[PDB]
Amino acid sequence: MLKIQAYFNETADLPCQFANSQNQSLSELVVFWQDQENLVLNEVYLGKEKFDSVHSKYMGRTSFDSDSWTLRLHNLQIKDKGLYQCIIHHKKPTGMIRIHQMNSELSVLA
């Protein structure tokens, strides 16, 4: 539902617009952005960034924002076009239940 176009070697932004009807806080939620190959891009565990599973090519180029809830990916490439997912999970004491998901497909100059 969200199509993003970027100029040749332009900057990439992935928002997913979490409504947050319950006025929840970042201390009780986890966020994942993943590509079409199932490789992780970033993780915000209960309010702090983690880099435990990001693939090497995805290291460093990511940046997370608090208020905007947008991930800023830099150094776009011709082969980086694909679909990204914004998976938000709630870390209850029993288990984690998915509470939001948003797809976004991005392509670069061809």
Partner: protein, 196 residues
């Protein structure tokens, strides 16, 4: 359009899938292990299928659909994927779903989870999940999948259809381990023997 046929067996199919990640061990498909039963007389569609080590009981409320067929498969890391084919869709109302998974082998027990899943992808439908036992680690449910349901496309005589409108797909998920999103993918060594 108003009435469903209410026949014996159907050639026309549909789609809705789910995956259960269990901790105990399953090697491969057995080609005839599943056994399924279906009901609609209540005005609510219900399908109860007993498979490799667990029984799955799914109920769609205010559905206008009756589950025609199903298929089950086992993949890597002990994942059990169940596809469910219903008659046909007449309206777009985002039916609710109730799913109960009971461990009938090697991890029996009492109730361990009785919460409901919001599915805020569109935030219109809610699925109530009840788990009996400890033989579950991941639970994913995709209503109106947009992927390739046709396996060995296609079976000898049956016709298969699938939703192509992104607005109707629904995703429900519950995980107990750490970051088990995308518990597994369709096109794999999954054999997908017919469930009956």
């Amino acid at each position: 359009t108003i009435c469903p046929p209410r026949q014996d067996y159907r050639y026309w199919y549909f789609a809705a899938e789910l995956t259960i990640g269990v901790n105990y061990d399953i090697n491969s498909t057995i080609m005839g292990e599943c056994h399924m039963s279906e009901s609609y007389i209540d005005r609510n569609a219900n399908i109860v299928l007993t498979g490799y080590g667990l029984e799955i009981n799914m109920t769609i409320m205010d559905t206008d659909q009756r589950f025609v067929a199903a298929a089950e498969g086992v993949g890597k890391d002990n994942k059990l994927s169940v596809l469910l084919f219903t008659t046909q869709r007449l309206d777009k109302v985002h039916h609710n779903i109730s799913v109960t998974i009971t461990c009938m082998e090697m991890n029996c027990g009492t109730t361990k989870y009785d919460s409901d899943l919001p599915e805020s992808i569109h935030h219109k439908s809610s699925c109530d999940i009840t788990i009996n036992g400890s033989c579950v680690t991941c639970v994913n449910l995709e209503t109106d999948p947009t992927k390739i349901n046709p396996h060995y496309l296609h079976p000898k005589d049956k016709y298969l259809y699938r939703n192509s409108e992104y607005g109707m797909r629904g995703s429900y998920g519950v995980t107990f381990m750490d970051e088990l999103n995308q518990c597994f993918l369709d096109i794999k060594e999954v054999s997908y023997d017919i469930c009956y």
